[PDB]
Write a protein that binds this ligand. Sequence first.
Ligand SMILES: Nc1nc2[nH]cnc2c(=O)[nH]1
Ligand SMILES: Nc1nc2[nH]cnc2c(=O)[nH]1
Lengths: 450, 451
Amino acid sequence: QFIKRAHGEEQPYWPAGPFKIRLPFVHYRWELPEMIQGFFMFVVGLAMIPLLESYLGMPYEAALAFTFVAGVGYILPALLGVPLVPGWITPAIPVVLLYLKGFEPGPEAIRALFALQIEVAIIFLILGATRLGSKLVDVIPNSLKCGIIIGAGMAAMMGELKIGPISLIVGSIISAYILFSLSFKNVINENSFARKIANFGMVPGMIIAMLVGWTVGEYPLPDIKWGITNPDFSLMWQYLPFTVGYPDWEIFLLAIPTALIAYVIAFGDILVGFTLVNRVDHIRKDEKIEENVDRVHLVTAIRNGFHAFLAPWPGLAGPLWTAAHATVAERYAMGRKSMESIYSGGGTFWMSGLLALFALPLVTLFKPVLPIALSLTLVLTAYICIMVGMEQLKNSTERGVAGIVAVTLAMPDPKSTMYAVCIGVILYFLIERPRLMGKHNSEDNIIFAD
Amino acid sequence: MQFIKRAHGEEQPYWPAGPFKIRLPFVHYRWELPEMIQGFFMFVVGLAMIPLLESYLGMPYEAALAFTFVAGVGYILPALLGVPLVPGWITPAIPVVLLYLKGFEPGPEAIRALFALQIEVAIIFLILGATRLGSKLVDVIPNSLKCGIIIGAGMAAMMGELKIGPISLIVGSIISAYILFSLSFKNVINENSFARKIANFGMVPGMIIAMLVGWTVGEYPLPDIKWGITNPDFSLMWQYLPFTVGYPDWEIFLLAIPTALIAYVIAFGDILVGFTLVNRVDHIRKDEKIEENVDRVHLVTAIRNGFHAFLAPWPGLAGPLWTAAHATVAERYAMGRKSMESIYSGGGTFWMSGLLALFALPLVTLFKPVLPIALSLTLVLTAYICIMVGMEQLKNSTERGVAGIVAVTLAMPDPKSTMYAVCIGVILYFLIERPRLMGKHNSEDNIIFAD
Ligand SMILES: Nc1nc2[nH]cnc2c(=O)[nH]1
Ligand SMILES: Nc1nc2[nH]cnc2c(=O)[nH]1
């Protein structure tokens, strides 16, 4: 580690306009636990391949090549100054698959996904450039923010249903148990057991699911191949807008309602991510973590535009991988003896994820169980969003509102979500603004609270 | 008119009848005009089971209509037998039961299946109720699990709106949830002439506006209004009962077990929600002493289910409460003696009026083309209240972290999975949690998900 950090100061970097550039070994140290974690947990990156095969009609190797593009994409946040361990807009997957499902899987569905993803890029770019992203984090009421987070969490679960199982159950419970039990103060100091688990993070739950999954017979054994992965970019190019067309203007319209809801859901992920960062920022007094919402929009905008052209992504580019981000945050809060900086954990993780792509025996090992990894990220997201959304509710008038908001955001048709927000406005103006149904004071609530 | 009136601070007049306390309308409690008007309209949710009967059980409309008369009599048993919980279906368990039924040929085969399932749920309610073990579970079961069940059940309910089969429903849902929310506050009716007039209609405004929008937009065909008195074709209905068709082999009862159990776990949540709301308004209303007998609720519910099994097998099953109706009565009840005399005068009047309403053929035929709005609405609204109450009932962050895991597994539609979770949860609990490996969990230690 060339440049070290002064206590209470910000992590070393090179100023780069709206971005703060950090490289591994130069600006932050290389974390062995996040290395091992990314060497194994990149399977979730590979877990998109089945969706690519179904909805985009792509052969396995073309799908495998796409994940190299996304792997590069996952390192941009810690590269450009974002403490949010990136991923997909995972609670938007069901909505996005719903959209794609109305196109023939193949070139037609690829043009469709291009139109959806470039818009999502544009929405992120404008809200980030005009700094209108930061405003919304401040302006939007807490009830709505919590309604969105919870709704987004419940969407993640109508999804586990729609994408397509003892594997997933043991996977979910062990994963969620570790996640939960390692969010407490001084856990590692209490037992030798929790000390050793904390260095593996999500690995135990994932690997144990696979194991149960193999022996039980839910998924076939792998056919391990030795050597270095050889991404077929010639093939991949056939499934890019460079080869297939670009969509007619009419397609962009069909995208709009899905584009928007996919953003609203991502906005949730930003709230969840910085909720966790803000917390561990206060625990760790030795680092000054910058929380720039506009930069998260910018990086994410870049990641999507990049994807749109080079690897159209059914899960889209999202601000965080909720469980990976929570897992790193937990290890970060454990102290400098454990993790030097939030970027040393965030950065190393996906860096190792990128290299891991080239470990052909791992790629080939994970190949028959990719479905376990896909449904698991969905389940784990749903868990953390529900948990965080709930806790962020302050009184009972917020909860009364968040309930209405969550329920509408978990009905999968996005035109319908907009029809709700629309009708919600009309009802608000004619009834609520005049306070015809009264003011709502949490201390007055006698039926649902107290 | 009301023969026996209640002394202030006492329990509502009744006739002792063993485990039950018998109350008739006009004799033990007054006849509430608002709940009369409400049940004259809101009995549509009772008729909204009809499509499920047609679809999953393969029966013609009229056989299904007659079934709703059997259910209608069933809905009056709680207030008749001393249960302050406005009754209904096990609504978050509908997807699960449909999933179960979905593996049988719609028709006699599926009716035999639904019998075995409903007799089982009945037996479970009977045994837990006779052995007073229903009361035990409500006390002993940790709060985290109780809330996990409630939140779980709430989310399962929306996987149901997706699975059962729409601007109508959005308007219906938002207005209905809006009213319910805003009429849960103290002195609301004293605030505005608007809320004063709204409170006397309860769920009706949301329902009727959903129906209307539903007609005018074209999502549902116009009704074919027929004048006169409903004439339930019980001759026809008999053909689709286990009396006419067979009774299922032992093998089927075994397939039913895992679904039966989960339908109970979900009903248990509905019991918690109902008595959460009752206990609150019981303290608001100091002039009435409301007895909260959990075991009596199991008995009446057990009776209702066994009743159904033979006379009208019910895809939604017989459940401890209709969540929005119970929330609605409780709200109007909390407004004071000027509005509602007793929790039984409103709850009792409501379904009494629903039963009479079945015989109003102009309303049946009016509601017929638009039943789908009604069925989806109760699903959405149950999800809404369960989520709201489950969340609020959580006290710390360790309870919440546990409730999260539980909610997520109980909202996966396969019921065998929910048990594999409880199983794997036990195995995991015994080997890791009890030896206290992975540390203690105290909410003030929580720095990631709390503080
Ligand atoms: N938002 C989000 N994106 C992901 N990409 C992979 N996993 C996840 C997740 O849990 N959440
Ligand atoms: N549990 C339950 N059962 C019902 N039956 C009709 N409506 C409902 C409801 O909201 N909840």
